[PDB]
Design a protein around this ligand. Structure first.
Ligand code: NAG
Ligand code: NAG
Ligand code: NAG
Lengths: 182, 215
């Protein structure tokens, strides 16, 4: 046997938003990220906590350096900026959809930068704030990001969903629909 | 079995001196943004046996510097990263720390994750069914649904009376859910005769034996 794996320590600091991130990735999935504010470690899946730990302060120390470095890079390039890169959005069910059986809708935001976006779940034309969750800004092989948004739902032929995504690289917000297809 | 994860230490870039001209940047009269982004990649070609640490630096949309443990010192991918390459490479105290990270970070962490991530296994839920309704325009698509599985290493094949159907296969490819599970749909396009039997075979590490579903 031969075990081939990739662990990526992904971190960043962004202006003018003044936002940073620090996370670990394993073969494409998040192991954890650190809440910069709370200064705590957030494991992607709860069960990961009993097998390891991470000193959050470490993430914050690095973000401080990334923050200082960001300033240098801006000076070194006379504050010249690049173009915003809009995301491609895809909505989909986590698993096969059966009426009456709890499931989860996935709004996949991909290939965009900077790592800032606005996502809104819509059920029957109204914003849904309960039963929603999201991932931090996940890394791709290149320099772009990806993100996952989630909505818990009970399949039904009377409900109609829309994932509305907004980015500085879009002229108008991107709106993706989804409904029970038999 | 819950050792503490190690992180690669971020290094301080130096400024004050230097400035580049004509930053060929997409621009696009949109909202100016500035991003300091770094990825420290630990690549394992066979567990810790052979390892490669690859650190990459990006400023906005461009990779401008990296550190490849196969080289042993920093290299500028673009001019914008040239100053840092020269500065950190001059600090032997630092070049050592970085080289050591293949052991102190990469191998260290791998040993921790090998206890729960490397062996993670979730068996797929396999289902087969006819596509669309009754009206068969030109083809009669057969869907093999393989979902809720991990790792992504999977083989999904169709068989018609024992023979493996190569052409006529339509797949969504491997879909990552972001929650440590994958899913895929592998559809077969066919033209049934009578007592023709179709089978979907699924091979995956979580399985002790292939999984077959007939239709
Ligand atoms: C991979 O590493 C293992 C030890 O963990 C070793 O047994 C094996 O020979 C190495 N290479 C191969 C052939 O997979
Ligand atoms: C995202 O929403 C916030 C509101 O808090 C707003 O300030 C920002 O402009 C929005 N982003 C975009 C790209 O419009
Ligand atoms: C931006 O950099 C250019 C160098 O190409 C410089 O001439 C210009 O003055 C700078 N921006 C300002 C301060 O106008």
């Amino acid at each position: 046997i031969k075990e081939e794996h990739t662990i990526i320590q992904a971190e960043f600091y962004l202006l003018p938003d003044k936002r940073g991130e620090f996370m670990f990735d394993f073969d494409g999935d998040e192991i954890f990220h650190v809440d910069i504010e709370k200064s705590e470690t957030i494991w992607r899946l709860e069960e990961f906590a009993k097998f390891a730990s991470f000193e959050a302060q470490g993430a914050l120390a690095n973000i401080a350096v990334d923050k200082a470095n960001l300033d240098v890079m801006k000076e070194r390039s006379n504050n010249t900026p690049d173009a915003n890169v809009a995301p491609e959005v895809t909505v989909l069910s986590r698993s096969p959809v059966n009426l009456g059986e709890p499931n989860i809708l996935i709004c996949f935001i991909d290939k965009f930068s900077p790592p800032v976006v606005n996502v809104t779940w819509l059920r029957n034309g109204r914003p849904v704030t309960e039963g929603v969750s999201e991932t931090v800004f996940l890394p791709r092989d290149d320099h772009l990001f990806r993100k996952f948004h989630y909505l818990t739902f009970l399949p039904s032929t009377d409900d109609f969903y829309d994932c509305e995504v907004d980015h500085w690289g879009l002229e108008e917000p991107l709106r993706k629909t989804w409904e029970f297809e038999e | 079995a819950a050792d503490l994860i190690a992180y690669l230490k971020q290094a301080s870039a130096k400024g004050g001196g230097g400035s580049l001209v004509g930053g060929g940047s997409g621009g696009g009269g949109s909202r100016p943004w500035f991003l300091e982004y770094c990825k420290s990649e630990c690549h394992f070609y066979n567990g810790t046996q052979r390892v490669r640490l690859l650190v990459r630096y990006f400023y906005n949309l461009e990779e401008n510097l990296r550190f490849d443990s196969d080289v042993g010192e920093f290299r500028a991918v673009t001019e914008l990263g040239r100053p840092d390459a020269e500065n950190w490479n001059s600090q032997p105290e630092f070049l050592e720390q970085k080289r050591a990270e293949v052991d102190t970070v990469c191998r260290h962490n791998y040993e921790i994750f090998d206890n729960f991530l490397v062996p993670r296994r979730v068996e797929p839920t396999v289902t087969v069914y006819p596509t669309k309704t009754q009206p068969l325009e030109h083809h009669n698509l057969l869907v093999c649904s393989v979902s809720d599985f991990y790792p992504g290493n999977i083989e999904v094949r169709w068989f018609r009376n024992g023979k493996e159907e190569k052409t006529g296969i339509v797949s969504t490819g491997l879909v990552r859910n972001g929650d440590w599970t994958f899913q895929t749909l592998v559809m077969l396009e066919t033209v049934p005769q009578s007592g023709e039997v179709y089978t979907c075979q699924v091979e995956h590490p979580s399985l002790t034996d292939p999984v077959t579903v007939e239709w």
